[PDB]
Amino acid sequence: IVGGQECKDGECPWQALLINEENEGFCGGTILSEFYILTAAHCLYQAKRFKVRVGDRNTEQEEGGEAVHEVEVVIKHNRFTKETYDFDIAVLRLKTPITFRMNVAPACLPERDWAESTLMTQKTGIVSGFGRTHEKGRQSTRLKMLEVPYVDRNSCKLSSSFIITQNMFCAGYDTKQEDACQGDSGGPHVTRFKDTYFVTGIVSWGEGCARKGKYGIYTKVTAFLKWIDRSMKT
Amino acid sequence: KLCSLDNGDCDQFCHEEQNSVVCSCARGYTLADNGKACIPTGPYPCGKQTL
Numbered sequence: 001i002v003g004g005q006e007c008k009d010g011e012c013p014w015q016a017l018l019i020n021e022e023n024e025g026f027c028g029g030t031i032l033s034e035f036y037i038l039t040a041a042h043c044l045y046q047a048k049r050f051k052v053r054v055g056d057r058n059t060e061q062e063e064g065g066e067a068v069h070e071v072e073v074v075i076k077h078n079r080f081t082k083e084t085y086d087f088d089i090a091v092l093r094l095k096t097p098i099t100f101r102m103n104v105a106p107a108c109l110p111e112r113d114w115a116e117s118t119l120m121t122q123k124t125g126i127v128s129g130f131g132r133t134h135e136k137g138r139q140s141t142r143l144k145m146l147e148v149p150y151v152d153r154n155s156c157k158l159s160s161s162f163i164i165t166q167n168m169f170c171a172g173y174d175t176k177q178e179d180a181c182q183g184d185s186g187g188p189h190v191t192r193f194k195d196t197y198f199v200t201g202i203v204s205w206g207e208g209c210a211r212k213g214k215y216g217i218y219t220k221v222t223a224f225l226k227w228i229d230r231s232m233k234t
Numbered sequence: 235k236l237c238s239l240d241n242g243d244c245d246q247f248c249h250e251e252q253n254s255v256v257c258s259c260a261r262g263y264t265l266a267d268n269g270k271a272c273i274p275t276g277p278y279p280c281g282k283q284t285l
């Protein structure tokens with residue numbers, strides 16, 4: 001996350017971090033239930049073998065709420081394509097169930113029509129993660145969150161050098177220096193409604209981080225609600 | 235009008251059925267007596283920051 005603030009105690013409890021062999025974060029995730037994590041399909045081509053970490057806010061110490069989980073089944077969308085990042089979505093089934101507590105809890109799944117007319121027409125969404133702090137920096141040791149305005153579909157297409165499919169949306173800023181970034185991928189885009197937080201996207205791609213004239217691109221979760229429901233059943 | 239007038243007064247999901255607002259809630263919540271509010275059924279319900 002370029003810009004934004006730290007997540008304070010209890011504020012981003014649905015964050016999940018995908019970790020490689022070196023206990024090193026390379027992608028984010030969203031806790032959907034005691035057994036399921038939502039992430040980006042393109043994250044699965046970034047580590048031979050990985051685990052899932054939840055309950056963590058500072059990777060440089062133990063605050064006592066941390067929990068690591070092994071993955072039993074990886075469920076990747078079959079229509080996912082490396083060439084455009086279309087259908088960039090996957091669910092992970094965990095070997096052991098997540099025990100909810102301070103800093104560990106799920107985000108809610110919305111229903112499609114209500115989310116598209118009521119959530120997605122809200123001024124902003126919220127993206128969070130342990131990714132780079134600026135295009136050329138290192139990853140954050142602190143979990144961060146950032147408020148990102150929804151971006152008109154038409155402008156987003158004009159601004160983009162790459163194709164924006166019906167399965168994607170745009171958020172972020174035209175010029176201001178705040179955006180998601182490298183390492184935040186597969187992470188949560190949630191929208192707040194009456195003190196309740198609903199999943200609205202997954203961090204997918206961008207032409208750098210916070211570049212003038214470019215927006216952040218996210219997987220349109222609302223197009224995938226039936227697919228998520230199926231995957232969560234086997 | 236209806237779901238477009240302040241969310242139909244619903245806490246969560248709003249749906250129109252024949253000139254009438256119908257409220258509902260995400261999984262883990264049950265609809266309140268007044269057919270509008272969503273009540274958490276157990277601890278650590280989805281979408282809530284932990285305290």
Ligand SMILES: C[C@@H](C(=O)N1CCOCC1)N1CC[C@H](NS(=O)(=O)c2cc3cc(Cl)ccc3s2)C1=O
Nearest residue numbers: 083084085162180181182204205206207208216217
């Ligand atoms: C243009 C795009 C890309 O590689 N594409 C090829 C596949 O199809 C989609 C575009 N791209 C360039 C580098 C960038 N990688 S990145 O640095 O990890 C990155 C992801 C990302 C996500 C969001 Cl939401 C904002 C900024 C960034 S910064 C990225 O995805």
Ligand SMILES: [Ca+2]
Nearest residue numbers: 058061062063
């Ligand atoms: Ca820690």
